[PDB]
Design a protein around this ligand. Structure first.
Ligand SMILES: CC(C)(COP(=O)(O)OP(=O)(O)OC[C@H]1O[C@@H](n2cnc3c(N)ncnc32)[C@H](O)[C@@H]1OP(=O)(O)O)[C@@H](O)C(=O)NCCC(=O)NCCSO
Ligand SMILES: CC(C)(COP(=O)(O)OP(=O)(O)OC[C@H]1O[C@@H](n2cnc3c(N)ncnc32)[C@H](O)[C@@H]1OP(=O)(O)O)[C@@H](O)C(=O)NCCC(=O)NCCSO
Ligand SMILES: CC(C)(COP(=O)(O)OP(=O)(O)OC[C@H]1O[C@@H](n2cnc3c(N)ncnc32)[C@H](O)[C@@H]1OP(=O)(O)O)[C@@H](O)C(=O)NCCC(=O)NCCSO
Lengths: 243, 243, 243
């Protein structure tokens, strides 16, 4: 690939060189490798989490008794685990021959944590088997280890899918980069109150923005529009996961 | 381009290898080729199809008498053909010297069909010369041949522009990949009722999400913001095509 | 990278070859170089410019007396200069060793101008030191020189960040390409009246669509969600820049 020509940046004013941490560098190399290997598409959707939110907030007592804080992330993790089992193509990777998919029968899910030194993506194993407060507690433990640089490589391996959550900061949508050899990544942005038409008038519903980026060699657009659609349905009524 | 390192995925759980159809593989190779050759931008827009819809639905009788089903796709196809003639840069391809555009004086348009074996994009020739019920009928014939694997290569060649429609499934917007050597692709997502300000109060209008991805070497951003804008205008009043 | 196979386009109809200007070609080569080097993410946001607009429109008299026309671009330029100093990572470039950032202590900002021959991006130097009517006047001078092909290379060098504005044409959002070796680019689309919930009811606020694309090797997603968030806040009350 052509390189970018070097520029004497100090011609224009005062410059200062600050160096990258090895995590940045590792991170930089991996994203570039994914960017060049994966033909990326992003499918955007909005889920009505009006009732999910009222549940989350009413279980605050139980959550405080268990020592966990229940945010939207354990709820996303449960729903995606369920879906990764209903739509296995999303749970798989392109074999190195380029002529097969390796379907994973397990569901481990990574989530992006933002630390001073760079990005880490700890993995929760067998997300499909834990409950909302287990996932709540583990998510929190892995994030504090990540931030403390006390997270060990054992816990950043073997993920099938990644959730990248910026809802705590802001934003309307974004287009995340697939962590190859995974095939998809859900980005989550900030929930807003919005008018949603009911057939007769607009009702304020609390809408969660979802951005699913995917590897188009493996996933075609209708399958991904279908994934986001089912996720939007599961989050509108999480009791459907009981069925 | 660096490859992605192989991972023993079976360390983490049970795996199963399922193979890709030759269509997937063909598809995979082509998208990767487009991804690396085309600097992609996506321009998003929403068109008010409140009146277009009421027309579509009122002509249901005529459509049933002709045996066709009239969806939004023949209407998109007519409007894009008209526009591909008003803005010829969108109707062209970058010559292999890299120093010229080959302007096509014809309008043939492909549309993405989703089949069990992978994606096919049949082509309707001379879209600019057929009527809404001709395009309606041909679209339907080509899609059933595509699904029946009875579509023959003659009909997947010489397209100038592609429409990729997921409105039947869901979604807010997405970023399609340009089918090189074409220069643009319109993605269409699901229409929603939305509040649109009239100067004094918000009115429910039925809004169609459009995502136009384009080859930025050939098309600059203002030309594409202008294409989506004119398309939004043509769909708001399709009688302007008579002018 | 594999090339795209040549197609005899004249099999399908009449073709015409028209050639690219040297600006297109230069432009084409640079975008391709950026596309392959930068792993791109776009973060979308909306800023409430209801009060900013009423200010802009009330200062029309002062502006007419100074000979300038004050649009939203000098206001974007001031706010981004302020922010490029609060968040210096956005004001920097990846050193050629790939292991350091070169932090620029200056703020010069480029803006995309659309001319018949192709795209030019003149640079305003030391944006952080000029006022709204200085930036208003210079922006206008550089754009008319650009359009007159009388802009000279001196003025297209040493930029730290680019603003690409299509608000004058239309569109909901788009994903611009980073001008390497810069690390981010703000795209601006058309402002719309929109319902924004106040805790009790929806209020029409005039919303500006922002699309920030960035070089993910250098900028991680939470930093960019934070940049767009602060910009949305500065534009909601530009007096915060006085603080
Ligand atoms: C650890 C975590 C992954 C997840 O955090 P979390 O458990 O959702 O929440 P948190 O950080 O504790 O913040 C929680 C508050 O914000 C709220 N919030 C979280 N998601 C929200 C959403 N999507 N919408 C609105 N509000 C949200 C929580 O519900 C919570 O409310 P209270 O303060 O009232 O309890 C996140 O802190 C993080 O670091 N994200 C970084 C992701 C990233 O950097 N991606 C970059 C790569 S881009 O390809
Ligand atoms: C054949 C077709 C292209 C087009 O189908 P179509 O003719 O528009 O409609 P359909 O499939 O018959 O479904 C029609 C129903 O959904 C509705 N629908 C279609 N577009 C709609 C839209 N954009 N918004 C809302 N509803 C829509 C129709 O109007 C119709 O309504 P009724 O059932 O009441 O008549 C589509 O079936 C298909 O396979 N699309 C796949 C595209 C794709 O996979 N892209 C992937 C690559 S991503 O880069
Ligand atoms: C010179 C300029 C950069 C900026 O123009 P400007 O100073 O904002 O405004 P303008 O062109 O004079 O048009 C101004 C009118 O549109 C309005 N307008 C500008 N931005 C607006 C916005 N974001 N929302 C709504 N309206 C807007 C102005 O406020 C102004 O209103 P009046 O006519 O009532 O005064 C632009 O003309 C241009 O050429 N943009 C091209 C960008 C581009 O091509 N990008 C492509 C690469 S894509 O990666």
């Amino acid at each position: 690939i052509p390189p970018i020509p070097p520029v004497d940046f100090a011609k224009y004013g005062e410059i200062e060189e600050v160096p990258m941490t090895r995590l940045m560098q590792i991170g930089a190399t991996n994203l570039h490798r994914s960017w060049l290997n994966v033909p990326h598409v992003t499918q955007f959707e909005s889920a009505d989490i009006t009732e999910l939110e009222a549940f989350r907030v009413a279980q605050k007592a139980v959550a405080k008794k268990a020592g966990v804080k229940l945010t939207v992330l354990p709820l996303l993790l449960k729903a995606c685990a369920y879906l990764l089992k209903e739509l296995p193509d999303f749970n798989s990777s392109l074999a190195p021959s380029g002529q097969a998919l390796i379907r994973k029968k397990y569901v481990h899910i990574g989530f992006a944590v933002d630390t001073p030194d760079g990005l880490l993506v700890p993995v929760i194993r067998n997300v499909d088997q834990k409950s909302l407060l287990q996932l709540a507690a583990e998510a929190a433990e892995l994030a504090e280890k990540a931030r403390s640089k006390k997270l060990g490589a054992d816990a950043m391996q073997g993920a099938c899918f990644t959730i990248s959550s910026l809802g705590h900061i802001g934003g309307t949508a974004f287009t995340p980069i697939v962590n190859a050899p995974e095939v998809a990544i859900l980005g989550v942005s900030k929930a807003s109150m919005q008018p949603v038409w009911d057939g007769k008038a607009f009702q304020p519903r609390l809408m969660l923005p979802l951005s699913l980026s995917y590897d188009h060699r493996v996933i075609n657009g209708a399958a991904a529009a279908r994934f986001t659609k089912r996720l939007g349905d599961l989050l509108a009524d999480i009791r459907a996961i009981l069925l």
